[PDB]
Structures are given as structure tokens and as C-alpha cells.
């Protein structure tokens, strides 16, 4: 643990500085160090962890998609053979992405999820688990794909079950979980109808609960509701 000698509070402070400097790899290393101190994470700290890894893996996913598109074009009929290089470099990016997902899943399993008892922590971590299995599924092939897909589904489902029992329909964690599980259904599980139904039901149940919210909470919830609507517009 390269961060073992740094104070927890200093790691959190440096994660916030790294965010301001758009140094997301550093931010993720600092937050991994903070998690490895063994204490539970506050709400702000959980979001620093997720922001950091989401940006790291997001860049990897964007690069993988560029390389996979080039690879597929090089394998079509009529294209010139340019050797193993595109595949090799796509594989390098893919292995680095899988390593990031393995790291995040390892933090969740040792030991964030098992110590998370409040809905706002447990749902957050189970959503993360679904998300990082989903990123693995995006690059997986064959039977490995099936088991990865089911692990994503299982984590999202447990998060959904808790969120419906313990959170209001406008809670931003609940909304973002539903948004992402809906995308899982559409893009990963080949279940577009389930994706559309989930997005619509989530949006409509949140709409009906907005009246209970302050102006700041209303802003947070309607922002994610607009993403649900955006996806519904893309899909219908």
C-alpha cells in the first residue's frame, strides 16, 4: 500500500486537490489509500471515491471504444491487413481497464459493502459494484460475459430492493442507480423493454414526490430525472 504512510485526512485533502487539478488517477490513488485505512467513508468521501474512479475508467472506456472500432474496421472484408498491432493495443487498454475494475471491486468486497448498513452507504456501494461489473461486461466475451453480467444484475437488484424500501423516490442515489440499471438493461442485457419501463416508472414516481423537496433537493433530483428523460428520448 503506497499510501500506507499518509494520514487519512491528508489523503482526503489531496484527493480534493487532485479533483480541482483534474488529476483523476492521483485522486483515485489517494481515495484507495483512504479506503485502505479501514474506516467507513462519509457521504462526501464516498463521492470522492466514485468521482475519481469514474473519471479514470471513463477515459479507459472511451479509448477502448475508439480502438475497438478501428479493430473491427480492420477485420472487415476488403480492408488491408495491418498486423497484430491494433488488437494488441486494444488488449493493453482492455487489461488496464479490467485492472481498474478489479481494484474497485476489491475495495467494495474488502470491506466497504460488509460494513455499510445505512441505505445511503449500502445502496451507493452496491450501485458501484453493478457499475464496475457492467464495465467489465462491456469488454467481456462468451461465457465469462454471462457470469459478469449476472454479477452486475445481482448487485443492481440488491441495491434497487434496498432503495425502494428505505429511500424516497427522489433520492439522488436511488435515481442514479435506476438510471444506470436501466442502461445495463438496454446496452448489456439486451432488454430494451425493461430499460424503458424502469426509466419511465422511476421518472414518474420521482415526479410525484418532488413536492416534498426543498429548492436545493429539487435541483439535485430533477437533474437526474432529465437524464432519465434523455435516455427515454434516445430509445423511443
Amino acid at each position: 500500500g503506497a499510501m500506507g504512510s499518509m494520514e487519512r485526512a491528508s489523503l482526503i485533502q489531496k484527493a480534493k486537490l487532485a479533483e480541482q487539478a483534474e488529476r483523476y488517477e492521483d485522486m483515485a490513488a489517494f481515495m484507495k489509500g483512504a479506503v485502505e485505512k479501514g474506516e467507513e467513508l462519509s457521504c462526501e468521501e464516498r463521492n470522492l471515491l466514485s468521482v475519481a474512479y469514474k473519471n479514470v475508467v471513463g477515459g479507459q472506456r472511451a479509448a477502448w471504444r475508439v480502438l475497438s472500432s478501428i479493430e473491427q474496421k480492420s477485420n472487415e472484408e476488403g480492408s488491408e491487413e495491418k498486423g497484430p498491432e491494433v488488437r494488441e493495443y486494444r488488449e493493453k487498454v482492455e487489461t488496464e481497464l479490467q485492472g481498474v475494475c478489479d481494484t474497485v471491486l476489491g475495495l467494495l468486497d474488502s470491506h466497504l459493502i460488509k460494513e455499510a448498513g445505512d441505505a445511503e452507504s449500502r445502496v451507493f456501494y452496491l450501485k458501484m459494484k453493478g457499475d464496475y461489473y457492467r464495465y467489465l461486461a462491456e469488454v467481456a466475451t462468451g461465457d465469462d460475459k454471462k457470469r459478469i453480467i449476472d454479477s452486475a444484475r445481482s448487485a443492481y437488484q440488491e441495491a434497487m430492493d434496498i432503495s425502494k424500501k428505505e429511500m424516497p423516490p427522489t433520492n439522488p442515489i436511488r435515481l442514479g442507480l435506476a438510471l444506470n440499471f436501466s442502461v445495463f438493461h438496454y446496452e448489456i442485457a439486451n432488454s430494451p423493454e425493461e430499460a424503458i419501463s424502469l426509466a419511465k416508472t422511476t421518472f414518474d414516481e420521482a415526479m410525484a414526490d418532488l413536492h416534498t423537496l426543498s429548492e436545493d433537493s429539487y435541483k439535485d433530483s430533477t437533474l437526474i430525472m432529465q437524464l432519465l428523460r434523455d435516455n427515454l428520448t434516445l430509445w423511443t
Partner: peptide, 5 residues
């Protein structure tokens, strides 16, 4: 691509 958070 669709929106996720």
C-alpha cells in the same frame, strides 16, 4: 451513448 452517473 446513453447517460449514466
Amino acid at each position: 451513448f446513453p447517460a449514466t452517473v
